[PDB]
């Protein structure tokens, strides 16, 4: 019942914390990979085309992918890449934290 | 009137990607008012103490910047939440 | 609010005059078709293309 | 795939198993007895209305 | 009373009230039906 769900949730969150790798010891590439850039652009374009608040100033453009590229140029994309290690461990890099090319 | 703490799994809209608390409230919690629920066991008379869980476990719970997991094929985000419901 | 400049024009164009809109998916998933429709009706739809959602359950969506 | 209808659940994994005679007798809609399909669907036949709607006949399930 | 759901053929009974909606190919559903014809079951472990 409620307590069974409580212990299930506790086990799930404990496993999640045991899998997360803290910011002070991640050993992945500092750069943003091409796949990461493409998916971050696609997801940000989806979000803005779904009537999300925007930060950069529109120059009359109406292509959501172009607006997402403008945001990536201005480093205004509020997204996090969760790079998954083979065993399930994950490092949460930020878009601004990564260096594009 | 019994206070029943529950854990939700709700969707977050890109329109509400800037005030996720009010987004979750208006998407899910506000409809539940004055409507009987097949899970809790009574008509919900209100809510309070809505706290959104974090997709990053190492983040301190006192922080104000939490992570929501975006659907791979949709700009919507799904996250776990905790909230107390006033149930009659 | 940044796309109605061209999408309204395409709806006015209709399915036949490139570039145009064959269908206008409503908020509730309804897929209206502009193929068997007149120019004035297409203009009216394009004028009502960007409207506030009257239903609360579908206030987090926009027409396609 | 409409992007305005998000799906919350997800299939984590699938495990192969054996369908036992008890559960299929429990889950089934009706048993099929006579080897006649049509006369209109044959009641108790392969095209019975308990196995789904069929040519403007509303499903009986 | 509340958790009693009926059938078109009159077989009313209480049972599974915990179902979700996932996104799958329909050929998966056809393959599931075909495997059920073979007596084989596939359990789909929904995540949440």
């Amino acid at each position: 019942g409620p307590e069974d769900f409580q212990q299930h949730e506790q086990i799930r969150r404990k496993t999640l914390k045991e899998k997360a790798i803290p910011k002070d010891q991640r050993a992945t590439t500092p750069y943003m990979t091409k796949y990461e850039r493409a998916r971050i652009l696609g997801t940000r374009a989806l979000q803005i085309s779904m009537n999300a608040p925007v930060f950069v100033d529109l120059e009359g453009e109406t292509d959501p992918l172009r607006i997402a590229m403008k945001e990536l140029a201005e480093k205004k994309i509020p997204l996090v890449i969760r790079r998954y290690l083979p065993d399930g461990s994950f490092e949460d890099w930020s878009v601004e934290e990564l260096i594009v090319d | 009137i019994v206070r029943v703490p529950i854990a939700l799994y709700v969707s977050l809209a890109p329109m509400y990607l800037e005030n996720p608390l009010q987004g979750v409230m208006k998407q899910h919690l506000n409809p539940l008012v004055m409507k009987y629920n097949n899970k809790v066991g009574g008509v919900v008379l209100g809510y309070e103490g809505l706290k959104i869980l974090d997709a990053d476990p190492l983040s301190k719970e006192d922080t104000s910047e939490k992570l929501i997991k975006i659907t791979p094929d949709t700009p919507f985000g799904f996250t776990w939440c905790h909230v107390n419901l006033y149930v009659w | 609010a940044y796309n109605i400049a061209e999408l309204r024009q395409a709806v006015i164009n209709g399915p036949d005059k490139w570039p145009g809109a064959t269908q206008i998916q409503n908020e509730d998933g309804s897929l209206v078709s502009l193929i068997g429709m007149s120019v004035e009706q297409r203009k009216a739809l394009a004028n009502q293309l960007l409207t506030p959602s009257s239903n609360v359950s579908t206030h987090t969506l926009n027409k396609k | 795939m409409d992007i305005s209808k998000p799906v919350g659940s997800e299939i984590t994994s699938v495990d192969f198993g054996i369908l036992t005679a008890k559960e299929i007798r429990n889950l089934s809609a009706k048993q099929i007895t006579n080897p006649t399909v049509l006369d209109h669907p044959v009641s108790g036949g392969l095209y019975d209305l308990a196995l789904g709607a069929f040519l403007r006949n509303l499903c009986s399930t | 009373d509340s958790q009693i759901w009926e059938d078109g053929q009159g077989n009313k009974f209480v049972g599974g009230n915990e179902t979700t909606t996932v996104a799958i190919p329909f050929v998966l559903k056809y393959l599931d039906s075909e495997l059920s014809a073979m007596g084989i079951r596939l359990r789909y472990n929904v995540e949440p």
């Binding site: 019942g1 409580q6 | 939700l8 969707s11 809209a13 809790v40 | - | 209808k5 | -």
Partner: peptide, 18 residues
């Protein structure tokens, strides 16, 4: 209705009604 936009995917009781 009942899309994944008005109703939660899962409602789970954290603890007994208190």
């Amino acid at each position: 209705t009942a899309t994944t936009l008005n109703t939660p995917v899962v409602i789970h009781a954290t603890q007994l009604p208190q």
